[PDB]
Amino acid sequence: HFKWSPPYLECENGSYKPGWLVTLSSAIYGLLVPEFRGVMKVDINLQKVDIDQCSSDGWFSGTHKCHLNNSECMPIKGLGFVLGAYECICKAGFYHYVCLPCR
Amino acid sequence: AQKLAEEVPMDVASYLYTGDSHQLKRANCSGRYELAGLPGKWPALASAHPSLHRALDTLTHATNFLNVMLQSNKSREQN
Amino acid sequence: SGRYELAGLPGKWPALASAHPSLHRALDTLTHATNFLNVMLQSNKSREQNLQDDLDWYQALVWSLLEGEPSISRAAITFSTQVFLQATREESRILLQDPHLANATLET
């Protein structure tokens, strides 16, 4: 099979420039048996990649801003690989990161 | 877990939580990031944008191409 | 009768639409082969070794594509750049051998 990889940053011994690099990689199966005869891999910018904190299942989705207390998560859907992008709604009560009941 | 897991990368929490130029425009990194756990459980393109599928498609095309081509008999190593 | 009764375009819409997953699979295979070629045939050092080992490249390409692709009935690549790898997955061996469609390609 191939080799999944990890998001990155444009730096090894420098300041991480724009972009976070998620890689795809594979090992060139040789040629009457096979063996490791090469390795080919690319890396794309995993930095303009919309992410979801309030998704049922997504990128490590944690709705840790509006659980129950008149809670709703009306999130910020697609901008890119950015946090604090899950807006919450205070469901039928007061609003003073505060979602509150009615009197 | 996730909360305690936020104290992971210093001079990057701007790039992590703010996703900001504080950790980017001026912050000495000297090292690339690594989502080997900073992602979800593993999303493995099971929680996928289509672009994952597009990438894997071109991947697999080139992969089969070179494999069958190298699987051609009498591999010459004629580079 | 004769063969190949194409009711081309009588279909709802045309043969220019989007209706299926495997359709888009082959579509991706299609356009990525096409861009691959338009950049590959535009390559440098085009010695055009059409007899030494470029034939291995072409045959591996056309066979492995249906060895990778699922909608794998029959196909060809007939050029002189007829030098035809006319390849059709009979059972698992691409039956290789060397039209108005070519006329229309020359027209457009």
Curated annotation (Swiss-Prot), chain B:
Positions of glycan attachment: N28, N73
Localization terms from the record: Cell membrane; Postsynaptic cell membrane; Presynaptic cell membrane; Nucleus
Highest taxon in the source lineage: Eukaryota
Family to which this protein belongs: Belongs to the G-protein coupled receptor 3 family.
Domain notes: The Cache-like region shares similarity with the Cache domain, a well-known receptor for amino acids. It acts as a ligand-binding module that recognizes and binds glycine and taurine.
Function in brief: Metabotropic receptor for glycine that controls synapse formation and function in the brain. Acts as an atypical G-protein coupled receptor that recruits and regulates the RGS7-GNB5 complex instead of activating G proteins. In absence of glycine ligand, promotes the GTPase activator activity of RGS7, increasing the GTPase activity of G protein alpha subunits, thereby driving them into their inactive GDP-bound form.
Self-association and partners: Homodimer. Associates with the RGS7-GNB5 complex, promoting its localization to the cell membrane and regulating its GTPase activator activity. Interacts (via VCPWE motifs) with GNAO1. Interacts with GPC4. Interacts with EGFLAM.
Name of protein: Metabotropic glycine receptor
Organism of origin: Homo sapiens (Human)
Gene behind this protein: GPR158
Shown part of the complete sequence: 71 to 149 of 1215
